Amino acid sequence: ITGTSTVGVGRGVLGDQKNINTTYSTYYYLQDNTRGDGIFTYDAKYRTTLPGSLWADADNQFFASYDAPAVDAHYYAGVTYDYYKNVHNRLSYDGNNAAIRSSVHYSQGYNNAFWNGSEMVYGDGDGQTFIPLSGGIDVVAHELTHAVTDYTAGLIYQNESGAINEAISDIFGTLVEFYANKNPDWEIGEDVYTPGISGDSLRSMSDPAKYGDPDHYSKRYTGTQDNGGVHINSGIINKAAYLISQGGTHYGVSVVGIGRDKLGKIFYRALTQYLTPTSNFSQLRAAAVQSATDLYGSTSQEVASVKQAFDAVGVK
Template sequence: MGDQKYINTTYSSYYGYYYLQDNTRGSGIFTYDGRNRTVLPGSLWTDGDNQFSASYDAAAVDAHYYAGVVYDYYKNVHGRLSYDGSNAAIRSTVHYGRGYNNAFWNGSQMVYGDGDGQTFLPFSGGIDVVGHELTHAVTDYTAGLVYQNESGAINEAMSDIFGTLVEFYANRNPDWEIGEDIYTPGIAGDALRSMSDPAKYGDPDHYSKRYTGTQDNGGVHTNSGIINKAAYLLSQGGVHYGVSVTGIGRDKMGKIFYRALVYYLTPTSNFSQLRAACVQAAADLYGSTSQEVNSVKQAFNAVGVY
């Protein structure tokens, strides 16, 4: 998105093209051109001079580069090799559909719309969005959280948490907001969601305010705010609904949620079971009488999850 990035490509002497194929990470990172159609994956991205400087190239460069950052984050921070833990290739398609206002993991690859230019810019331009969607793949291969009701809200929160931690890892204007780089280009300072203050965008920040209807698979993008707030408080500390939380920092927070996701959560885990999973993960990592365990309990107390 308007800046310079250095990416790994592959040259074919036979065809005389450079491909968006990074062979330095796992089984490779491959980025495809959807050509505004909806057939996946599309064609592997090619370029004649290895510069990828055309405006049409930007979405592909972002998807390719940020997929590499997400791979590096999971490998270097958590010792995880790609989303499946076994170095699966990471495939992304950009320019999916026309003015398509979404991005998604379809079970085998990443897909990014270009946005309509008003509500959204091309989705691959947000590193937290790329981290969010690829974390859905990690969740698929670990806890397998069912995408409905509380388990679905945990699924969404895990993607917001690790999408944000990837953004901090890359140190690209990091913050506790989700999608700020690609949302409403004409309006400064807003985002899709906030982890530090979910209520800013109408999401609940306490269990007593949870959504109990049936829309959005039982409010998976809404009730995730409750868990996002707990994760934020665990990292940064603060007082919320009169409950004081001692922050333990982003790195420890991430390690606790990752361990809970990989070892303790099941497909149907609810919020209360997530709390227990995080308490156990913190005890494993830092000891059962540690400040970290106490802070996990405080953070979930603060959002009304027991």
């Protein structure tokens, strides 16, 4: 809509208050004009037709329980846009400041969230396995990163390229979580998963095997479920990235950590310059090494760490 930019206040899924950017025109809408061509959040009203209605609110105050997921989807998309812009100099997912849209209250008891090729979609969860998915900043950034990949490497969603695509989304959702300093960790979805159980998460980058995902190439899944194990085999790549960043000894191989910032720089460069739709793990290793070489020099420690980390997960 056309209107006046303003700021409203509300409460997120976890109960935390935050300010959000709104647009006033008779109603207050969840439309943030401060970022690129705008961030817009929609109400899918428990249906599966998309996008639903642009979020309209009467008073610029979003404290109703039905508002919670919209507030977080709206806010976390802003943060993620900021991360890309500030950190990598990239304007929105297309690099051209494309509007960012998300719908919430998608379907009923839907335990998932996704990027559908045009926008983001978030379920409310069933209240047992998950609470509304947009309450996790790593979830929001994982989804938005899928847009980034679509517009850049374009990794197809199956087999190795598909696992790389998902790992990429976990790496970057985690770097975003550290960026916002929102109780950061190397776990995925900890904040919205199994409200009943503390301590767990959906996936672990630090120890994928903790939840039964592979942490070495020799353990890859080779069947057909999950599109050829996109969400399973991403653990091998997640582990590698954790090592590059944090360092460690894995399967006897020692890796000196080079930190998060360099991890992001390296991976972002690989994604945007070297990866292709059909790249496999071995190709990702080459890309990562080339990126680091570019950035830091072939005899750099950085290059060394990237090599070690892949060797440690068995990726040649």
